[model samples]
Target chain A: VMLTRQQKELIVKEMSEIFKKTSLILFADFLGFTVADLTELRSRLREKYGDGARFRVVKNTLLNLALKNAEYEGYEEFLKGPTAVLYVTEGDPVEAVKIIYNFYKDKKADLSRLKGGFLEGKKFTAEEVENIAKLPSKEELYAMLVGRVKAPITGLVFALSGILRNLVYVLNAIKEKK
Target chain B: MTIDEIIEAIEKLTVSELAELVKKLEDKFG
Candidate 1:
């Protein structure tokens, strides 16, 4: 099907905007998925993260044009048949990837495979996308930071308790001597 | 220790060690 010039331009503009706004865009090949399956998957994603998703089934030509115009390199190879992109603009990438991974499995659509996509301007493979889900989330990293910050203070508190106990024992001994 | 020294110390921990330190802090004061 041939898109008119205006339609092509509109798609390119929309995709470019998505590229600019998102930290990562995961593209997948949805060859065997039906309309109902796609709708269900989209709804599941939206239900989990309301405004966090920008998922869409896209044309390869338009995606290529958009990526070229947006100056995002090296994703041309992944723009295979029935391409759909899950653009994550506002949430943890690890969590987002996890949701997609789980959703694909739950759907049990064996033919819909991950074609991989860009992560913060870097093209990643399907394996890398899978690996991303195993990485720590932003909240987890923040918790680690807070934990590390409190460690030394905790040490000081324990040290102070020991000194305070020693001082009390010394005072008791002096009172007994008196 | 100074704040800079503490930050430097925190930076030196591996991922597992960092997780352990966080758990220790939570157990004590969190």
Candidate 2:
């Protein structure tokens, strides 16, 4: 379908608005994702993040126009192929990546490749984005620390005594043999 | 097709078809 100048303008405007409002924008290649797959992913994202995030497919040309209009630079390289944009507007951006990363891993196939993204005015490569996903969230780290602190001092002392008892038993056996 | 109609059509496109559509758009617009 031939898009009129006005129609193109409208799309560019809408996309630019999205770029402006989104705190983080993730690009992924949604080449093999079926409609059901995408719908399910979108549902999970909305369920987890509510109105704080959005997932959409946009034409690369129009997307580039919007990116330019929104003063975003250096994202055009990742615009190739069937690009799906994940716009993170609120909440921890890392949570959004974890959701997508988990979803991608669950597929166990080379679908929905994470291309790259922008966060806090910095551009992250695909590898960097994956590394971010691998990182433990603040809540998880706090829980881990709390669990460590909750361990009983008596348990540590028992563990140390058990090791000492074994060592002393070995030394006594060696002395008797000598 | 209008913008909404085009988006509707896009929603129904297969992965390969979506890639082709992007290529066609690039070729036509470039």
Candidate 3:
């Protein structure tokens, strides 16, 4: 396809940005969406995200090459066949996945097919993809993961405080006995 | 190239190679 210099520059610039960030990313197959469907999807996504997705369905060869040359790692190894990459522009990438997951569920698995995908450099199998696909959006996961990590610390602090309180009470009782 | 192909290539290349790719694409398809 013929592209103007400016357009080429823009594409390069955009693709470079995609390469550099610790961005939330996903790869999926969008084989059967219609123009209207795609339009609605983009519109809804844009509304939620406001140009949130640097989403593109490009030739796998080009995508693979670009990813490899960029050393994006792990993810490029899984590139095979038709794929759509959802690059998060602003919001959490998990939300983007959430959007796709909800959309797929609503269609009752009739509209889009779930093949496989990757995230944060981890390649996922079909079953894993389904689980990750259904995971709470990124923000929710962050909150959830935060909770998971903090729970033990919070418990430790509370336990320590309880021991100290009991020790003080015991000392007071001992003093009275003395 | 398809998105998959680009992803693969980008995955393999060194970080600095991205700018070169931008140049190559401009020459190859510009």
Sort candidate 1 into its docking category.
incorrect
Residue A62 of model 3 has an lDDT of 62
| Candidate 1 lDDT, A123-143, residue by residue in tens | 788877667767776656666
All candidates' TM-scores? 0.64, 0.65, 0.56
Pairs in steric clash, model 1: none
Ranking by DockQ: 1, 3, 2
DockQ of candidate model 1: 0.09
Candidate rank order under lDDT:
1, 2, 3
Number of clashes recorded per candidate: 0, 0, 37
| Model 3 chain B: worst 10 consecutive residues (lDDT sum) | B14-23
Measured against the true chain A, the candidates' chain A TM-scores are 0.70, 0.74, 0.63
Best candidate, DockQ? 1
lDDT of 3 by residue, A1-178 (tens): 9999998666666665565563456666777766676676676678778976755687776676567655666665446668877666565455566677666666566423554454555455556555554554434433443344456677788888998899899999999995
- Give the whole-model CA lDDT for all candidates, comma-separated: 0.75, 0.75, 0.60
The CA lDDT at A21 in model 1 is 76
TM-score of chain B of 3: 0.47
Candidate 1's TM-score on the B chain:
0.84
- Compute the lDDT for candidate 3: 0.60
For candidate 2, what is the lDDT? Answer: 0.75
